[PDB]
Amino acid sequence: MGLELFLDLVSQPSRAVYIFAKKNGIPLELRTVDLVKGQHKSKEFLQINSLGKLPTLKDGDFILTESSAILIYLSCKYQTPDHWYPSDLQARARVHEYLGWHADCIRGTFGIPLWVQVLGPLIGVQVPEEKVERNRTAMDQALQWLEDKFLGDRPFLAGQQVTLADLMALEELMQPVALGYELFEGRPRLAAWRGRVEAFLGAELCQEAHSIILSILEQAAKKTLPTPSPEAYQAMLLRIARIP
Amino acid sequence: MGLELFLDLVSQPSRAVYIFAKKNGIPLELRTVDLVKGQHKSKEFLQINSLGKLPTLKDGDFILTESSAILIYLSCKYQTPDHWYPSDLQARARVHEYLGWHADCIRGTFGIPLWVQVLGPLIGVQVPEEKVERNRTAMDQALQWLEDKFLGDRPFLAGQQVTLADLMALEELMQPVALGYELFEGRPRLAAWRGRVEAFLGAELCQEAHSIILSILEQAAKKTLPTPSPEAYQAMLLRIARIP
Ligand SMILES: N[C@@H](CCC(=O)N[C@@H](CS)C(=O)NCC(=O)O)C(=O)O
Ligand SMILES: N[C@@H](CCC(=O)N[C@@H](CS)C(=O)NCC(=O)O)C(=O)O
């Protein structure tokens, strides 16, 4: 089986998967890949995943990418609790729906702050104020939608109990926070849903799942951060180039 | 049951779903919503889907959005052929993985041309060349990935037979084409994959699923296009504002 999971705990979709696996207690070989360094671009890694993206899971000689795909697969193969990924048609539909919306309106919008504050200047590139602002108004714009649409009255985005949907959302949301953005400030619903999940995941897990990222802003200050490889240097420029 | 599907055949995720339902022959009440007009923003529609996005399906009093979520749900509830959404763990994982990647690298990048050429100017807004270019190089950049990563040797992105993965990709791909972008030009693998799918879907269905969009560029020239409502006008501004 081997079952290895290549990931960097800085990447949020990496934490989401790492957390699910850990909490459900699934044997996994944690394969660290310094993203900031450019290891996911190493010839060796590309031999594992041509896309050079994290996280990617290798079960046997079957390599799979995409936290969602991974998360689901994992959940299935290991028959983890159903509340996680309900077999109920209506219930699972609600999960998928959020994941879809998540990829459209959450992923890629809530990761920008790290670029603006860390990765961006790491290679000398400074993000234009316009986008920096445009980004944040975009964020809360989406935080609200998330709040009264998915969260609404219920306790979770996908329904009545913690679900993959939550693990993704919060992990993705925690990034800006780790940079000093308190998106929960004036959103009791959010704060409460967050506090809820954190509650269900246990301080220990979360306390370690995060660690890396809440420290990063510092290694940034103190220049502990590694110099990106040219292959990562290029990927970085691309991503920054697409921040609207 | 009622089972109604609100959609505009201009939106690609709308076609994808409309096609699947049609091809699998699933009773559905086609509920047209002039996107360009701004009907998906009509107080009435919002009573149906707060997000004001298309397509959305209403089965009973259970309203669900997101083509993927929809597609899957539909496929399940109506026990349509398995090749579509394989129950095989490894096989379904491959689907999900593409859908994930699709939402990241396909959706939102291949729809831009219509904005640049149609919707943009429709409201007086002209898209900057930079982005117009940046966009296309981004497109083929992704078309390639798609080509040698998902399509690779095999006949389909998700595996050996047509799958939701394909229905999404091609429907999303067809847009730029409909505007005059032949993304299949120097990509036999693609063209061939396309030709294959088109083959499996039957000229009739596809000939009607498209119609609307291949004519649009003209109603644009001839000014047949409706004046967007201010609620659509604002939506449009936002989207255009996020074209990097
Ligand atoms: N949709 C994928 C996206 C993965 C992704 O983009 N990961 C980042 C780390 S935060 C990465 O590997 N970036 C480098 C690259 O893709 O070139 C998922 O959520 O699993
Ligand atoms: N991720 C969703 C996106 C749906 C979407 O953005 N649809 C467009 C039509 S092409 C729309 O409704 N735009 C108006 C808006 O969202 O304000 C899906 O693919 O189902």
Side-chain angles (χ1 to χ4, degrees):
Chain A
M1 138 264 214
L3 208 74
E4 358 175 25
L5 164 65
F6 311 67
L7 83 183
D8 180 341
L9 270 208
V10 176
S11 165
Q12 48 288 301
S14 299
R15 300 201 289 279
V17 170
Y18 158 92
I19 282 173
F20 180 91
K22 263 218 148 229
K23 179 64 149 73
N24 263 137
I26 299 136
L28 272 185
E29 257 302 282
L30 291 230
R31 235 60 164 191
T32 303
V33 193
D34 200 319
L35 286 167
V36 203
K37 205 156 175 24
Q39 282 199 27
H40 52 311
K41 311 268 100 150
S42 65
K43 302 171 171 145
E44 15 245 71
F45 184 62
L46 297 179
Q47 268 282 291
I48 316 168
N49 175 9
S50 40
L51 293 177
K53 297 190 157 94
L54 279 198
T56 140
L57 175 89
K58 185 200 130 88
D59 172 294
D61 57 2
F62 175 78
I63 312 119
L64 172 97
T65 77
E66 281 300 326
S67 31
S68 27
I70 279 145
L71 278 160
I72 298 184
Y73 172 95
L74 252 86
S75 100
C76 261
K77 207 202 134 98
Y78 293 69
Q79 53 112 88
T80 46
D82 152 276
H83 75 263
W84 271 120
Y85 186 54
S87 330
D88 172 23
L89 258 214
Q90 219 122 110
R92 188 173 289 191
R94 305 251 74 124
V95 165
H96 283 322
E97 165 171 74
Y98 171 78
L99 284 185
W101 179 84
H102 178 264
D104 262 37
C105 284
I106 289 307
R107 159 67 180 56
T109 285
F110 288 67
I112 298 227
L114 176 84
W115 291 96
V116 157
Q117 257 132 60
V118 167
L119 306 206
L122 206 211
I123 62 198
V125 184
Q126 199 234 37
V127 197
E129 243 325 312
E130 337 323 303
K131 323 180 137 171
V132 184
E133 266 291 323
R134 184 175 306 125
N135 168 62
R136 86 221 322 175
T137 124
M139 278 183 81
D140 43 22
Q141 219 144 50
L143 278 173
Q144 185 81 223
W145 267 327
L146 177 88
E147 234 190 329
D148 51 47
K149 154 66 155 127
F150 295 83
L151 228 222
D153 55 14
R154 72 224 54 126
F156 301 85
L157 327 155
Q160 277 304 331
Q161 304 159 249
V162 52
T163 140
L164 310 198
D166 299 81
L167 213 43
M168 305 245 66
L170 176 45
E171 243 8 86
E172 188 76 47
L173 248 82
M174 280 314 306
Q175 207 99 319
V177 182
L179 281 315
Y181 290 78
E182 225 85 73
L183 333 168
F184 293 100
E185 290 303 54
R187 285 136 184 304
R189 277 223 180 108
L190 246 222
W193 150 84
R194 168 234 240 261
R196 236 185 243 106
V197 179
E198 299 213 301
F200 169 89
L201 300 169
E204 249 166 73
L205 218 199
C206 281
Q207 268 211 236
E208 75 190 286
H210 281 38
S211 73
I212 324 294
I213 99 244
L214 4 226
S215 75
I216 209 130
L217 222 263
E218 171 150 353
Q219 318 168 342
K222 314 178 150 191
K223 328 229 188 136
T224 272
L225 260 6
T227 303
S229 74
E231 299 74 2
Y233 168 74
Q234 176 191 67
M236 267 167 106
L237 275 166
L238 239 25
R239 146 97 241 208
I240 297 180
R242 80 175 82 126
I243 279 159
Chain B
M1 274 279 316
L3 205 74
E4 0 176 26
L5 166 60
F6 311 70
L7 85 181
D8 179 340
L9 274 205
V10 178
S11 161
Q12 49 285 298
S14 306
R15 299 201 288 275
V17 169
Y18 157 93
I19 282 170
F20 179 93
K22 262 222 147 226
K23 180 62 151 69
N24 266 136
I26 296 137
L28 273 182
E29 256 302 282
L30 291 231
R31 235 63 164 189
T32 306
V33 195
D34 199 323
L35 287 164
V36 199
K37 204 158 175 23
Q39 283 199 24
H40 55 309
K41 311 268 100 151
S42 64
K43 301 168 173 150
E44 15 244 71
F45 184 63
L46 298 180
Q47 251 283 307
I48 319 173
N49 171 12
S50 38
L51 291 178
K53 297 187 156 98
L54 280 196
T56 138
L57 173 91
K58 184 202 130 90
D59 172 295
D61 56 3
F62 173 76
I63 311 122
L64 170 99
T65 80
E66 281 298 327
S67 31
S68 25
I70 280 145
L71 278 160
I72 296 183
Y73 174 96
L74 252 82
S75 96
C76 261
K77 206 200 140 101
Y78 292 70
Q79 52 112 92
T80 47
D82 154 278
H83 75 265
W84 270 122
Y85 186 52
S87 332
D88 173 26
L89 259 213
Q90 217 122 112
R92 188 172 288 191
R94 304 251 74 125
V95 168
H96 284 321
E97 165 175 70
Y98 170 81
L99 286 184
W101 179 85
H102 176 264
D104 260 37
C105 282
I106 291 309
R107 159 66 178 55
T109 281
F110 288 67
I112 298 232
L114 175 86
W115 292 93
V116 151
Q117 249 111 79
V118 182
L119 303 166
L122 206 225
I123 57 167
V125 176
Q126 186 225 44
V127 174
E129 234 355 277
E130 337 323 302
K131 325 178 141 172
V132 186
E133 266 289 320
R134 186 173 305 125
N135 168 64
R136 83 222 323 179
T137 121
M139 280 180 76
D140 44 23
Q141 220 145 51
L143 277 171
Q144 185 79 226
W145 268 328
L146 178 81
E147 232 191 330
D148 51 52
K149 156 64 159 122
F150 296 83
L151 225 222
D153 252 56
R154 72 229 53 116
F156 301 84
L157 327 158
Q160 276 309 329
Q161 306 159 245
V162 53
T163 137
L164 315 193
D166 299 80
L167 215 42
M168 306 243 66
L170 179 44
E171 243 9 85
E172 188 75 47
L173 247 80
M174 281 317 304
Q175 208 106 316
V177 181
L179 288 340
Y181 291 77
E182 225 88 73
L183 338 166
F184 293 102
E185 289 305 53
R187 283 136 183 305
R189 286 225 203 111
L190 267 207
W193 151 69
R194 179 246 253 259
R196 225 166 298 129
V197 179
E198 298 213 302
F200 170 84
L201 301 168
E204 250 167 69
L205 216 203
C206 284
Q207 267 209 238
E208 77 189 286
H210 280 37
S211 70
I212 324 295
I213 98 247
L214 358 234
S215 71
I216 208 124
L217 223 261
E218 319 187 33
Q219 317 169 336
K222 301 187 189 210
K223 304 195 170 224
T224 281
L225 260 20
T227 284
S229 76
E231 293 93 340
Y233 170 83
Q234 203 188 34
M236 304 177 73
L237 282 202
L238 242 25
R239 146 96 242 205
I240 299 186
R242 80 177 80 129
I243 281 160

